[PDB]
């Protein structure tokens, strides 16, 4: 629902999702063959499943086609400094794709907003929803559409008949955090196949032995996983399949 939904949020108030007490695989997110740009700093895109972190912070918002190059640490513009600042030690993983067939319509889609004016900079990883009229001079105006006070929030120009650099691109960033808490979301192993009556090697969560798997005639109680013998040797492991 964070990727495929009916609508998204703006950049001044974006959706914040936390992945806790769950597990996922980043292999399906790479072979989709549907993303336009894919940048993943801090770790390799193909070697981030073996090593895992504590928590995963994912934010979702919309951006134009010419602003996709602005999501990077080490530059100054108008959106990367007033809506979402990127720190120096930014090990995020940004994913972007083109889905102009859902967030665009005839007549002008101005559903989402953005911030253009701001007094000063902001600390990274901080949301700004202040709708106060930014003053450029030294005299107030009581919040009117006159002189020396302009509204910082402005509309968009999204249109499905545009080119390629001005289309609404669904951009998401997957950041990782290494805290004192143990790693919750990591990389799990799957079930490939089962072979028996041959000298093979298996790893049933408690040992890695090389041998054959013969059909036994004794049934174990439904609370054990392994089994020893007289000579104190684990030669009976229940298949969790």
């Amino acid at each position: 629902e964070v990727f495929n939904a009916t609508r998204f949020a703006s950049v001044y108030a974006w959706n914040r999702k936390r992945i806790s007490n769950c597990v996922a695989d980043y292999s399906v997110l790479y072979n989709s063959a549907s993303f336009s740009t894919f940048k993943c700093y801090g770790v390799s895109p193909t070697k981030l499943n073996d090593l895992c972190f504590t928590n995963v912070y994912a934010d979702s918002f919309v951006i134009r086609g010419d602003e996709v190059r602005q999501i990077a640490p080490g530059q100054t513009g108008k959106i990367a400094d007033y809506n979402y600042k990127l720190p120096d030690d930014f090990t995020g993983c940004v994913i972007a794709w083109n889905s102009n067939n859902l967030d665009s319509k005839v007549g002008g889609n101005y559903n989402y907003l953005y911030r253009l004016f701001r007094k000063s900079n902001l600390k990274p990883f901080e949301r700004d929803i202040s709708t106060e009229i930014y003053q450029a001079g030294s005299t107030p105006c009581n919040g009117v559409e006159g002189f020396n006070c302009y509204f910082p929030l402005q509309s968009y120009g999204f249109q499905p008949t545009n080119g390629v650099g001005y289309q609404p691109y669904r951009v998401v960033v997957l950041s990782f955090e290494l805290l004192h808490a143990p790693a919750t979301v990591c990389g799990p192993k799957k079930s490939t196949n089962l072979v028996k009556n041959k000298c093979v090697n298996f790893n049933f969560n408690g040992l890695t032995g090389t041998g054959v798997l013969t059909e036994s005639n004794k049934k174990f109680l439904p609370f054990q996983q392994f089994g020893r013998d007289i000579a104190d040797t684990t030669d009976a492991v229940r298949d969790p399949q």
Epitope: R16, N111, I129, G143, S155
Partner: antibody, heavy 123, light 111 residues
């Protein structure tokens, strides 16, 4: 400032309701205005919030496309239109005001509220 | 819906009464600030405390709000003759794309 609303109003089950939200003074054409309802029996819901400066609609995903909220800059008022009423619409609506700020959370707060409009529809 | 609250709590006129509400890890535990409101039966609700760190104008100091991880807290000291209302917890939810309130608890029991 103070926001005054209309009194009680009864309509038909399947017609359109026409209420308004008046503002006394200023500070209405600079901040966002939302509508919060309350029904005896359950919690409080939030339909959506409308900005008067840009005139952009922003509703929630739980409410379908059946309610339209407009804004006016000549007299600084807001109207609410809702057709195809049901037996659940028996509640009261409030004309609230939002004042954003800065911080790590940046959540929408309701500092200023309205009076209330009792909208009861039945047989 | 996503925010659950106890149906009713009990207290004594002079002791500390603490109320809280539990949600998910995407609306209150993600990092968003919480807002507590008071729904009096006969008037419109007003603002009591926002962000659990500031104090608005017109609200006493006896109200104390804090956020312990993924849950908020509200503690009061002394029960006066104006606490016959309901307490709701409001937080911005990302799955609902908007703000959602809580269940609501009743303080007054019987007199």
């Amino acid at each position: 400032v103070q926001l005054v609303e209309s009194g009680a109003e009864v309509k038909k089950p399947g017609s359109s309701v026409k209420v308004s939200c008046k503002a006394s003074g200023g500070t209405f054409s600079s901040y966002a205005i939302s509508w919060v309802r309350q029904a005896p029996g359950q919690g409080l819901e939030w339909m959506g919030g409308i900005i008067p400066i840009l005139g952009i609609a922003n509703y929630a995903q739980k409410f379908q496309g059946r309610v339209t909220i407009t804004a006016d800059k000549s007299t600084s008022t807001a109207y609410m239109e809702l057709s195809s009423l049901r037996s659940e619409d028996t509640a009261v609506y409030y004309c609230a005001r939002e004042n954003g700020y800065s911080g790590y959370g940046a959540a929408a707060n309701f500092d200023l509220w309205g009076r209330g409009t009792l909208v009861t529809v039945s047989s | 819906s996503v925010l659950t609250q106890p149906p009713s709590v009990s207290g004594a006129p002079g002791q500390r009464v603490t109320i809280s509400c539990t949600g998910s890890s995407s609306n209150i535990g993600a990092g968003y600030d919480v807002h507590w409101y008071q729904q009096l039966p006969g008037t419109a609700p007003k603002l009591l405390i926002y962000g659990n760190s500031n104090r608005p104008s017109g609200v006493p100091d006896r109200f104390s709000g804090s956020k312990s991880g993924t849950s908020a807290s509200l503690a009061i000291t002394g029960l006066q003759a104006e606490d016959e209302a309901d307490y709701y917890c409001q937080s911005y939810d990302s799955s609902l794309s908007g703000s959602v309130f809580g269940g609501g608890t009743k303080l007054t029991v019987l007199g």
